[PDB]
Amino acid sequence: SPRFRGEHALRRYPSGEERCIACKLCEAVCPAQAITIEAEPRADGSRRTTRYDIDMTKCIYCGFCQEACPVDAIVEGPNFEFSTETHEELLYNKEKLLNNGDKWEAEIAANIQADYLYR
Amino acid sequence: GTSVKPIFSRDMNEAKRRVRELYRAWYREVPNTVHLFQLDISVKQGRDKVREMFMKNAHVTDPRVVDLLVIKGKMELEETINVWKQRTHIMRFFHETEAPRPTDFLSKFYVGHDP
Amino acid sequence: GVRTSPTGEKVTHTGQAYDDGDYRRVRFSDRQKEVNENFAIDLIAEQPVSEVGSRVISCDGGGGALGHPRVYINLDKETKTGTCGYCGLQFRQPHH
Amino acid sequence: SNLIEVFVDGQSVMVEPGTTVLQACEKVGMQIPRFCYHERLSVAGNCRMCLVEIEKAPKVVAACAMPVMKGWNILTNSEKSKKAREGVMEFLLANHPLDCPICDQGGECDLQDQSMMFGSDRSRFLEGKRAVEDKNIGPLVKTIMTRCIQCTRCIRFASEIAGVDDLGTTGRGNDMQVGTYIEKMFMSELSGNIIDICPVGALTSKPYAFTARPWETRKTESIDVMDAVGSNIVVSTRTGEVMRILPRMHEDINEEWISDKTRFAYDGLKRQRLTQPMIRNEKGLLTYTTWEDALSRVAGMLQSFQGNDVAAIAGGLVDAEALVALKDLLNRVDSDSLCTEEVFPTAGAGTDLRSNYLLNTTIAGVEEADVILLVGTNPRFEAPLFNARIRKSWLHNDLKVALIGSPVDLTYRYDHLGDSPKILQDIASGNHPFSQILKEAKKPMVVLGSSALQRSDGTAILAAVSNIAQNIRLSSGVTGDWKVMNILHRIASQVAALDLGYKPGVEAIRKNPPKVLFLLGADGGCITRQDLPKDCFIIYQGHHGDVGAPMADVILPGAAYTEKSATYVNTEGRAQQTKVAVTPPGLAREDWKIIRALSEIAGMTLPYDTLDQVRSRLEEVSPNLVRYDDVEGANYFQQANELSKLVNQQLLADPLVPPQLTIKDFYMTDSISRASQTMAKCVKAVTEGIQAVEEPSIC
Amino acid sequence: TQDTQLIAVDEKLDITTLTGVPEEHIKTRKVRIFVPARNNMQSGVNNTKKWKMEFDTRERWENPLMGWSSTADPLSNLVLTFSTKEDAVAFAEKNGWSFDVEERKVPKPKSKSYGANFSWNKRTRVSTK
Amino acid sequence: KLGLREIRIHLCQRSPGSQGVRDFIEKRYVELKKANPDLPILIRECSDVQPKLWARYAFGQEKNVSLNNFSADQVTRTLENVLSGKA
Amino acid sequence: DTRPTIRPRNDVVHKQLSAFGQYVAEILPKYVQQVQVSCFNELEIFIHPDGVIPVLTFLRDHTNAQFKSLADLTAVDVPTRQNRFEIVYNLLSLRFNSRIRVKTYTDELTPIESSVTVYKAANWYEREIWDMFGVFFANHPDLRRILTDYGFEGHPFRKDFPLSGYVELRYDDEVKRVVAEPVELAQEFRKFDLNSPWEAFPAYRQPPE
Amino acid sequence: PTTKPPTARKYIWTNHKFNVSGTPQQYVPYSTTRKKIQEWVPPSTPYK
Ligand code: SF4
Ligand code: SF4
Ligand code: SF4
Ligand code: SF4
Ligand code: FES
Ligand SMILES: [K+]
Ligand SMILES: [Zn+2]
User: Fold this and answer.
1) Where are the beta strands (DSSP E) in D573-664?
2) Helices D111-118 and D79-94 sit at what angle, rounded to 10 degrees?
3) Disulfide connectivity (chain F) (predicted)?
4) Which residue intervals of G38-141 are DSSP H helices?
5) Dihedrals φ, ψ of A95, to 5°?
6) A64 to chain G nearest CA, in Å?
7) Which chains sit next to H, with 3 or more Cβ pairs under 8 A?
8) Cβ–Cβ contacts within 10 Å for residue G56, how many?
9) What 3-state class would DSSP assign to D512?
10) Exposed e or buried b for every residue in D168-182, given b needs 16+ CB within 10 A?
């Protein structure tokens, strides 16, 4: 279903600008403390993260982060086939999560359009 | 109130009596533990470990604390006798993997900030 | 744009790259360093500035409930542009 | 016995007349909601959040401004009181921006918390919100002014506490805006305090921006060492990193304020840090080495010289533990040349009597004063919170202030007597008109800055000022418990060093230059390699590479004041201890532990292996050094005054000029604030203008 | 007062041998007993009412893999709450923790008068409102 | 070699046991300083402290006599002996 | 009911439970220290630790009580009390379709009486309380650890026990077995200070000191 | 997608990639933040 909670992703506006403005609400609400965030003013003055890690082996895939997010920046995507041969590839980076967003945005956005009126 | 109720012992001599009984039981159990768990240590080593575990609490003067220590020691003895503990549990009294921590001021100063 | 370090390591959008003496570069050997090549700062820099004819403009990020919390931006400074503090879109009054 | 009886929800309390409704509720443990009200500011009564029902009274009253009447029953939880609060919160949130995720106030706001606790949970505002343009008031306070709720706290603070009338409101009605009208910097030593008093994210810290959320920070309570006030602070840390500095309330020292150097110079704690031991290679250059190697080098140099051949200089940021450890170590080689960079007159009593070298009236005591005399000092920049207390007493107690020195701006009007030190002799002999003012005064106070003791005639200046203080105490014009004589110190390590028997100033080392020189955080540049024989073996121990580190033969990386539990004695004499917020970086170590390790390697092991043991040693040397938060009285001013009359030194004709005449001289004073880029931005903004330092505050 | 066979005991309660705490984290720790300061960012006083027990902060380093904050201190997050200072010191003493306790700092009463803002001859008069 | 480097006088402002040393400092300390201008005589008063005299000699060797309930004449004798050998 | 959000209050059950609490306090004055009914109609009996067996047996066997089921037996740690441990008995009466809570107290060194003779269900609950809080139960048929690892030191549910404890476990290839070491965390737990500086509930305000 | 194609974005991958675990294209984590503490660099000029 469109509500399915799989692999996480960081999303952008149509302009290509990131949605995350580093409020840290997802990190505050994360039941497993799987989200690690560091932020600072960007060179253009924007409020943006410099660290955004999700320990996917700490994660319980509850979807509380995407509920807390006020800008639909962090989501749980539809992907569920991302098993790894080592423990280290499951400790996600900001680059990893942004590449997940760019990889899956086409269907992530369709799922969100399907379910956002219930949210 | 001014006074308190005992666990078992109404005095320090009673606490000592039970401590001696527990020490006796542990001392006799050690060879059977060494044989049964197939430990790579000697019976002298195990009995010295039992003594050193007893000697950690030699400073205790409260008969109720002594009674609870005896209760926990008997619990540990029953885990050892009934083979509820594994070999790894028996061998955890001997911190064979942990490196020798520093004790003097200079080495502790060299390796970090901890007092 | 995504540049290169003097060691040849790729520099991320947060400006991270190990120095030439950092042993931690051994983690990328026989592997790759994962870098997102879409720098959001350069992307939002490419967007035009809207010439709206009002002192106060409102921006919710586009898509209504799918954008960001709706905010109001003052456009009285004639040297600066009023930009949204959520999505970076810029606004300015017509031709001053 | 003139207390009246009022009721707070039926419970009776006895209050002094003039107590407001808010205070009467405060003494039963009930905190009335408020935005504009601050207990340390004047009453404004504009936010209307404190409205409360008086039983039998049809109209609600502003609890913050309304004095209680006899027999009044305050209904703090009646439906009328709740509806007043809900309406006021609705009006406050009508035009408030939806900035909580992007606003640094989120999680510790007040608007958020009182919306949750006292306002409704939903909106019925169906219109477009207000938006005002941002104001730039310097590189320290980011003003996102469309978040402002017009509580006037910043304006009241700036006008009363800081003494600068730059903040204000322009326009009226819904488009009334808080600012400076013109484009003008809000430069003041106390400027950063309008961030904390601001209930919302309208005024925020630029250095702290976007960097942390309130809930994730760990709060370590410690003491400021950027001056000798000893302001109580909270150090916010997160994941092993110092995040910001906040004021911590102490009614007797700093109230709830800190100076801008205290607030923002923590930027320097991340730059130019000494992290590893260093020695000189065969090419003469400093290179990293192990602790054992460097310590063995120093110990080899230690046990080859003795007496006057080994000396030590203590810098301005050094704890008492390190001071006593270094003194013990140097005494082991029979060395008594343990000096400080800051000179205090050693003639007469010198350091023997503790009352000779501290603020005897205490920081809280200037409120009780009738008249204060300031000599050769700029308390505004030397000790900003002491000057804030002086202005507080100038404002409420109608304190009269006179000054000898440069006509420096002090944020309050005072009477300028002159700048030549000859006036002190003029007052002491009773010829000057101000001598009568001091004589006809119940609680006079004479404050001599430690900055004026750095002169070559500082001994004569101290003698003349003591002659002034004694001349008004030999007549029955002041009680015995009141202390008139005070020394205002500007160096955080100075009073502890004097207490422990350090020699004030580095004249002993100039008299007998050492072959071994311990530079214990000494970055003043008083002693350079040209004042030392040819091959002096200079040790530097500290946390920053600023001045002393370049010239040293060995470098011992020490801990900064946020990285150790350390005793610091303030200008009035009370010992206070910091606590570690983070550990020292790299291989840096606690300073007394470095000295103890060096002593053991040298074969002269100091008799303490622990912080409690070094603190008991401190107790053995001077027992007041472990009486934390207690100000111990020091007596025998008359002994010091009759000892001071034998030195018969003269006064120079040189005018008394403070080292800091304007704000640009305030920011950059020690090694931490010289490594601070925020202090550099402050200096740049002060010296050039508002367009010099630029930063896009666009989110 | 009751039939419990009241046995005489010393008034130095010591439960350190029963807590299971490793010996390093008893003698070498130093707890702080204090009422937390009011967060100067807010004007709410509801967090300055109870006494706190916090341990001395130890070393936090950076994780080589992710740059996370690592620790080897089991008591880095342990924070106990107490109603009075006496309860906190009794708890610290029976647990064998060396402690320093500081006196609670409360705001001193202050004389607030709105009518002072318009004084006829005092400096308390405000130039703006 | 083991000459006297400094003396520390610890006392209390109000405690009756430090009253003799308080009197000594009031009436005799200035003469002691005029006779010993280069000797550090560090007088440190602290509340509820038992009166104590410290004498630091060469190479960090210190010894403390106790001055509790001393008369000013006794503190004068105790300082005379410390400052002149006998002790 | 024009209040669709507020939980409805049932005063009949409140009165019934109040009357039964008065009844229980009157029948056993020797052990009942306090009885109270919550705003959500839950009745608690506060007793001296000596009265555990008498009060529990009365509630089980009295024809007007018939609390035949021991729903739960747990402990609560409150360090600021000299008797830090609060022992909680939750009992259910099928005959009267009612529930009751019985609470007493103890410290680290005073044994609570085992109630296995009253309820056979108490056998594992008392073992669990001993395991996680360290409370001794005198005359327990078999008192020992139930939840924690063999040889585990400490009582984890005490408020002063650290969340991750003191030891970790890993397999060591040199000694060819699982070993225990002092705990190190690659990422330490991040302590959050969440409490608001403003009072939420005035009705629960404690009087000032 | 033939009947309802996804919305075109310029940042969406134009080439889908499968699970590259166990390949030299696998993801390896690293810290994305810059160094916190700057050390003091000694002068290159000797004092003597
Ligand atoms: S899904 Fe849940 S556990 Fe996973 S990161 Fe989001 S909030 Fe944390
Ligand atoms: S992902 Fe969303 S909730 Fe998390 S910090 Fe960014 S904006 Fe806030
Ligand atoms: S000040 Fe900031 S956190 Fe507070 S209500 Fe306004 S936007 Fe939200
Ligand atoms: S800027 Fe802040 S302190 Fe000043 S009036 Fe506005 S809300 Fe109040
Ligand atoms: S608090 Fe009384 S009106 Fe603002
Ligand atoms: K603010
Ligand atoms: Zn926008």
Assistant:
1) 575-577
2) 140
3) 12-46, 12-46
4) 52-61, 122-133
5) -65, -40
6) 17
7) A, C, D, E
8) 22
9) coil
10) bbeeeeeeebbbbee
Residue B12 to residue D598: CA distance in whole angstroms: 48
Q: How far is CA F26 from CA E8, E55, F23, F30, in A?
A: 54, 46, 5, 8
Our answer on whether F and C touch (3+ beta-carbon pairs < 8 Å) is: no
And the tokens for A75?
Answer: 């989501």
List for chain B the helix, strand, coil content (%; round to 5): 60, 0, 40
* Tokens 């484009």, residue located: D183
Q: What's the rounded Cα separation, in Å, for the pair D229 and D255?
A: 12
Return the number of other C-beta atoms located less than 10 Å from residue D578's C-beta.
24
Query: For tokens 């924007």, what's the residue?
Result: A46
DSSP symbols for D251-281: TTTTBT---HHHHHGGGGGGSSB--S-EEE-
Interface size B-E, in CB pairs within 8 Å, comes to: 48
- d(CA D372, CA D482) in angstroms, rounded, equals 13
Q: How many CB atoms lie within 10 A of CB H41?
A: 9
Calpha distance G106→G83 (Å, rounded): 5
In the DSSP assignment, the letter for residue G139 is: T
Q: What's the total number of domains in chain B?
A: 1
CB of H30 within 8 Å of any CB in chain C? Answer: yes
A92 belongs to an annotated ligand binding site? no
Query: What secondary structure letter does DSSP report for D480?
Result: S
Locate the DSSP E strands across D489-579.
516-520, 537-542, 554-557, 567-569, 575-577
Experiment type: cryo-EM
CB-based pocket (< 6 A), ligand 5: D 34-37, 45-50, 62, 64-65
- For residues G67 and G101, is the Cβ–Cβ distance under 8 A? no
> Are D576 and D588 within 8 A, CB to CB?
no
Residue G111 Cα distances to B21, D77, F2, G55, G85, angstroms? 22, 46, 64, 17, 11
Length of chain E: 129
CA distance readout (Å), D34 to C65, D111, D312, F39, G160: 34, 10, 54, 61, 37
E39 φ, ψ to 5°?
Answer: -60, 115
Q: Quickly tell me which residue has 């001696």 as its tokens.
A: B20
- The sign of the dihedral angle between the CA atoms of D346, D351, D353, D354 is positive
Q: Where are the domains of chain F?
A: 2-87
Q: What resolution in angstroms, rounded to 1 decimal? A: 2.1
Could you identify the atom of ligand 5 that is nearest to the CA of residue D46?
3
Rounded CA separation G27/D224 (Å) = 64
Q: Which two tokens stand for residue D658?
A: 């403070």
Q: Tell me which residue range forms the domain holding B69.
A: 1-115
Cα(first)–Cα(last) distance of chain E, in Å? 67
Q: Which H or E run contains G81?
A: none
* DSSP E strand boundaries for D253-351: 278-280, 286-288, 310-314, 338-340
DSSP C46-58: TSPEEE-SSSEEE
Q: At what angle are helices F19-27 and F72-83 packed, to 10 degrees?
A: 70
Cβ–Cβ under 8 Å, residues D129 and D97: yes
Amino acid at D437: I
Q: Which of D239, E74, E24 is nearest to G168 (CA)?
A: E74
Q: Which two tokens stand for residue D264?
A: 């923002």
Residue E7 DSSP code:
B
